[PDB]
Amino acid sequence: ERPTLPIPDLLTTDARNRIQLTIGAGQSTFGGKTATTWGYNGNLLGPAVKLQRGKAVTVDIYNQLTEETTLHWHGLEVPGEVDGGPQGIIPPGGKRSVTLNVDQPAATCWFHPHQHGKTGRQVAMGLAGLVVIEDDEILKLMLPKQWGIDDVPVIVQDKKFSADGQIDYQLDVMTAAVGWFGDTLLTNGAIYPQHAAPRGWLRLRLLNGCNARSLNFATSDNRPLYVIASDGGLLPEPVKVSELPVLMGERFEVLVEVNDNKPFDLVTLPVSQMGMAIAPFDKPHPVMRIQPIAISASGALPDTLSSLPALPSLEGLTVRKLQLSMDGGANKINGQAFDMNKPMFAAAKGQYERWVISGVGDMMLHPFHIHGTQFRILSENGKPPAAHRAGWKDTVKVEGNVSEVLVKFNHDAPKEHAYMAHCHLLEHEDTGMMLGFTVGHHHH
Ligand SMILES: [Cu+2]
Ligand SMILES: [Cu+2]
């Protein structure tokens, strides 16, 4: 029998308003073969940290790895000080406590290491967790909300394992250029698991947690997916799609119908991306089996989900140009491999800016991620974004063309705890396709 889909623990504050995350190495089993793996509160992956908008919490982070790491909250609008980029080193055995004061809409964000030059490796070893942000608005909506029953996180990741069963990761020249990818697909750490889903609506919180592999979700019998949310939260209304491309580090929440008899698979369809159509990803590849069950179901598909603000006039907005490049081993932005002691520029706090990110000059896929914000895509690789990508995003496709995003940073980031903007193809990031920027002013 297929293993059941592991469900990350939905982790809330304790009585002292704290959350403990312990980073550790342990063992996992894949295809009957044990492997050393890393996890948060466990041997692999991590919990779903549940936060409420407007309610500050403290997170105590205990690094019990023998090596240093950082803990970055991907998609969270937080000050640079708690952003957990490459300057937020947690030494081995170290502890760091951060205050998260969430001030953004309900969304599924995530967290992962951001160690300079080792982000790819540390994610590959198993470290990743989720952040479930709720607010008053979403809780009014009657969406499926039984965690691990009809509201299910789906963290999809490939890994490359050596013949000894261990995770095989080396940042060699090939891996640096094309990315780290493998022939084994995991769904919350499990190979082709099954999920028992109540008849009615099933909500999947999809995260592409791969280092380098882009995905394209569909169902085996071509029943539609109704996209209800993107990286930064709810769409205004559901967007019905037959397939759903998801770039590295992107989240989408979809609703899918479950009718009593027919089990079906969520699958990923072959993508046009260097390395990624190699077997077994040359064909539609199962991600997980949905098995209908006859237990109580908590939700439906609302006709309207939220509001999206109108895009503002662009006149007078600061424009920033970011040129991605790959000059062999050296991956760069504006002709510079990432320099931790030199932020490329100082962004304004609380002001819309237009950032123009170009991948002209190479044909590789660069999902470009900007810390400290949820932005609106104005142009995605030469076209206005698709309906389901037109809301709140922290990632924009850059692939041989030019993208334009409308960003606003609500929180300070000084030069000592700067925000990152980078390609989220982790091997590019680690080999220099990243820049630091500050937001606001600062005086100590
Ligand atoms: Cu991030
Ligand atoms: Cu890239």
Side-chain angles (χ1 to χ4, degrees):
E1 279 282 302
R2 295 321 304 158
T4 52
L5 177 72
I7 305 301
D9 280 6
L10 191 60
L11 180 54
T12 62
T13 50
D14 65 15
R16 277 184 36 259
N17 208 42
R18 297 221 154 188
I19 293 174
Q20 288 210 138
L21 291 171
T22 294
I23 322 178
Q27 292 287 115
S28 302
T29 301
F30 306 103
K33 285 186 172 50
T34 66
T36 300
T37 59
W38 303 352
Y40 299 109
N41 294 354
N43 303 313
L44 183 62
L45 284 166
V49 173
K50 184 170 172 172
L51 307 176
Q52 300 135 70
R53 184 175 189 158
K55 177 56 180 189
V57 303
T58 299
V59 190
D60 299 316
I61 305 154
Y62 301 86
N63 179 16
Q64 302 183 338
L65 302 167
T66 54
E67 76 179 70
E68 68 188 85
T69 192
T70 83
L71 196 159
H72 167 63
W73 311 88
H74 179 139
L76 295 208
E77 300 165 12
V78 293
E81 194 160 317
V82 304
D83 187 47
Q87 296 165 305
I89 301 307
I90 312 177
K95 178 196 177 182
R96 302 285 146 169
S97 302
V98 299
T99 308
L100 303 182
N101 182 42
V102 177
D103 190 21
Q104 65 195 85
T108 304
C109 291
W110 67 298
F111 64 97
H112 64 76
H114 227 300
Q115 180 71 19
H116 181 220
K118 310 185 195 194
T119 300
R121 175 157 180 280
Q122 297 199 339
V123 177
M125 290 302 296
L127 293 179
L130 296 174
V131 178
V132 168
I133 305 177
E134 302 195 328
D135 59 23
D136 285 352
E137 180 179 74
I138 197 165
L139 294 175
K140 287 173 185 174
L141 286 179
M142 314 294 285
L143 296 162
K145 58 173 159 51
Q146 305 177 71
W147 187 258
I149 294 177
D150 60 9
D151 181 6
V152 180
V154 183
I155 303 170
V156 184
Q157 307 176 292
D158 63 336
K159 291 200 196 296
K160 200 266 182 263
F161 295 99
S162 33
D164 57 2
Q166 302 295 338
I167 297 164
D168 178 355
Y169 188 99
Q170 288 293 279
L171 193 53
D172 60 20
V173 180
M174 194 73 85
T175 306
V178 312
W180 188 70
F181 68 98
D183 64 7
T184 302
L185 197 69
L186 309 179
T187 314
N188 298 347
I191 299 175
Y192 185 38
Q194 56 182 312
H195 183 68
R199 294 160 25 259
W201 292 95
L202 172 58
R203 178 179 176 182
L204 306 179
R205 307 176 182 247
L206 302 172
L207 165 63
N208 182 349
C210 302
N211 279 37
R213 175 182 296 286
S214 66
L215 296 170
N216 181 11
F217 292 109
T219 63
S220 58
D221 64 7
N222 314 287
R223 71 179 71 199
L225 299 180
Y226 298 84
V227 187
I228 61 159
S230 56
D231 304 322
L234 291 175
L235 304 178
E237 62 181 23
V239 174
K240 187 190 84 104
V241 302
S242 285
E243 52 187 68
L244 181 53
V246 185
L247 307 178
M248 300 79 82
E250 282 187 336
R251 294 79 63 205
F252 288 93
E253 307 181 33
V254 300
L255 261 61
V256 64
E257 288 198 1
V258 180
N259 318 114
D260 198 15
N261 180 337
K262 304 162 168 72
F264 64 98
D265 284 348
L266 184 69
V267 306
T268 183
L269 307 178
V271 299
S272 181
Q273 190 196 336
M274 174 83 64
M276 306 309 158
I278 296 175
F281 297 93
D282 57 325
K283 307 177 173 310
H285 192 294
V287 172
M288 68 177 207
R289 191 161 72 199
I290 293 98
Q291 171 63 48
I293 54 167
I295 63 171
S296 330
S298 66
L301 185 76
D303 291 325
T304 309
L305 298 166
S306 65
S307 204
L308 216 53
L311 297 178
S313 299
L314 311 179
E315 204 71 11
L317 300 193
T318 296
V319 185
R320 301 192 192 283
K321 304 173 275 297
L322 294 66
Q323 182 64 66
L324 309 181
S325 72
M326 305 179 61
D327 192 31
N331 298 319
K332 305 179 197 176
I333 307 180
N334 297 344
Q336 163 163 111
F338 175 60
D339 179 1
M340 189 138 85
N341 318 319
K342 213 322 193 320
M344 197 169 290
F345 53 83
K349 187 172 68 173
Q351 289 290 294
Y352 291 113
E353 304 190 336
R354 280 207 286 125
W355 287 29
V356 176
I357 309 101
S358 170
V360 173
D362 73 76
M363 291 308 113
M364 303 302 284
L365 172 62
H366 313 283
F368 198 76
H369 173 58
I370 302 165
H371 288 203
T373 191
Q374 286 295 332
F375 56 70
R376 304 296 297 280
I377 299 173
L378 302 180
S379 186
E380 188 161 42
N381 210 46
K383 317 174 161 162
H388 64 285
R389 299 177 68 83
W392 297 115
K393 299 287 281 81
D394 61 41
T395 307
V396 59
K397 187 177 173 189
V398 179
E399 183 187 60
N401 207 303
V402 184
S403 295
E404 176 181 13
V405 302
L406 177 70
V407 298
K408 184 160 102 78
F409 307 98
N410 297 325
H411 310 274
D412 296 312
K415 137 189 56 153
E416 322 82 70
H417 311 283
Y419 288 137
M420 300 291 109
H422 60 97
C423 174
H424 214 286
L425 193 159
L426 299 186
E427 287 62 50
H428 290 174
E429 180 192 324
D430 278 345
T431 56
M433 200 176 284
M434 176 158 67
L435 67 79
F437 63 104
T438 61
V439 168
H441 293 284
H442 194 95
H443 291 266
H444 270 85

